[PDB]
Design a protein around this ligand. Sequence first.
Ligand SMILES: CCCCCCCCOc1ccc(C(=O)N[C@H](C(=O)O)C(C)C)cc1
Lengths: 248, 251
Amino acid sequence: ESADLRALAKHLYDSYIKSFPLTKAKARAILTGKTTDKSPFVIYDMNSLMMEVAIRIFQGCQFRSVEAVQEITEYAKSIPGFVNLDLNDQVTLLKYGVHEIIYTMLASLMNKDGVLISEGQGFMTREFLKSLKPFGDFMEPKFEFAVKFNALELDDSDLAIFIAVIILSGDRPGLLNVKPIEDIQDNLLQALELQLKLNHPESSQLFAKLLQKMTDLRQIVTEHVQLLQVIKKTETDMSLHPLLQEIY
Amino acid sequence: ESADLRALAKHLYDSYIKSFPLTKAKARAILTGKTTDKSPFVIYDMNSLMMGEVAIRIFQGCQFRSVEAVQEITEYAKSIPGFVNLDLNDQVTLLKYGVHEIIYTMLASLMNKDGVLISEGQGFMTREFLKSLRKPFGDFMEPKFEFAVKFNALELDDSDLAIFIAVIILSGDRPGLLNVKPIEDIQDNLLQALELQLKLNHPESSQLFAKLLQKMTDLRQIVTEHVQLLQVIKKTETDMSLHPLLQEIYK
Ligand SMILES: CCCCCCCCOc1ccc(C(=O)N[C@H](C(=O)O)C(C)C)cc1
């Protein structure tokens, strides 16, 4: 029924809005399309940054991603059926799902020339990011993914359902009861297909093309974790990282 | 019109039968009870293999079959409407990156949880025998089996796979492509054809289209994994030759 499908899609949209402060609609109005309201502060070089450095930028993105994990966790609890799953499976779905969501939503904050930081009050250029040490290789593959992903011109109402599809994957390692997970995802996939067909009636096979993006997403995440343990061989020692590295 | 999509599906299935000598339909008839003029000889250990270095012999055997498969996939690709009209470097690029994703898709038709058909279905090599091979080589086929058991649960037949194999070839996110838009135009048409085919062939099968497309992630990971394993071999086995066609596909 278009009935419960449209009703599920509005439910998820409203919950997405409540859970994520910086929407895509708002990031775009700030980005290359600019409201004549308040320009963000631009970080293009060391002196504008001041106004290790590659390590504190790295650490700042960790702080932000820990915040996002909690925004995504509350969103997932609004997906019908998610909280009725086995508690271990809920934890497993979030553990393996959260990077994919982070890089998905980060694309909403990026264009080919940079990424919004600090709730949109800043803008760090793509060029300044490449100009770092081993840390110059972190954000480039996300910019390359973002550029191709944003070419799909999804909006928040589309991304709300797509994010739920990612969370309810079904193939995460260690799940205990796969069936209700794939049952929920089936119904989310149906809602996503109808949502794309009504929201983008002239965008042929957009559903299929969105699903193909999960390929690049999982490769991006796989690639991110390998660089993450490469720097466990640059930063290594001393103890005044107390509960800090515990929180991360 | 849906009528044009059915004709596209029929064309591709017809070329598939012509290009691939061992279909899933024949593989499943050999594997299951069915025909007993098709019963394979089973290789599960050294002496049954001796009756049909060992690890390397088996690996050169896989290499030859792989080269054979590239030739068959290449023949199939030329039948995909528009493929031969595209720029040449791109045809080559599409084949370079598509070939192994297709080989591991079609290899599932030859697999069950216990082993894999070989020598055009005359033989069956056990999954445990392949895993007991010396070190680097015991690890080649096991992720392939793991993929196949999940992929075979979709219950696709050759007419479904013909269209899916064409979707894979005509990607357009392949590294180094010159003109992406004519590629995506073909793939869009193929995706409509796949979508209609699954809805008609598997009517009671909810969201099979989405589930099948999601499987393109597992294929990408298997190739990536496989490429890492081959780097190990090139260093431990300096007296061993990869095939030129396979060398040029890998970079
Ligand atoms: C069907 C007639 C010949 C039977 C041989 C069956 C052996 C299983 O089929 C395989 C097994 C492994 C591969 C494979 O991954 N080959 C690798 C590749 O081309 O990347 C390496 C040989 C390089 C390809 C085909």
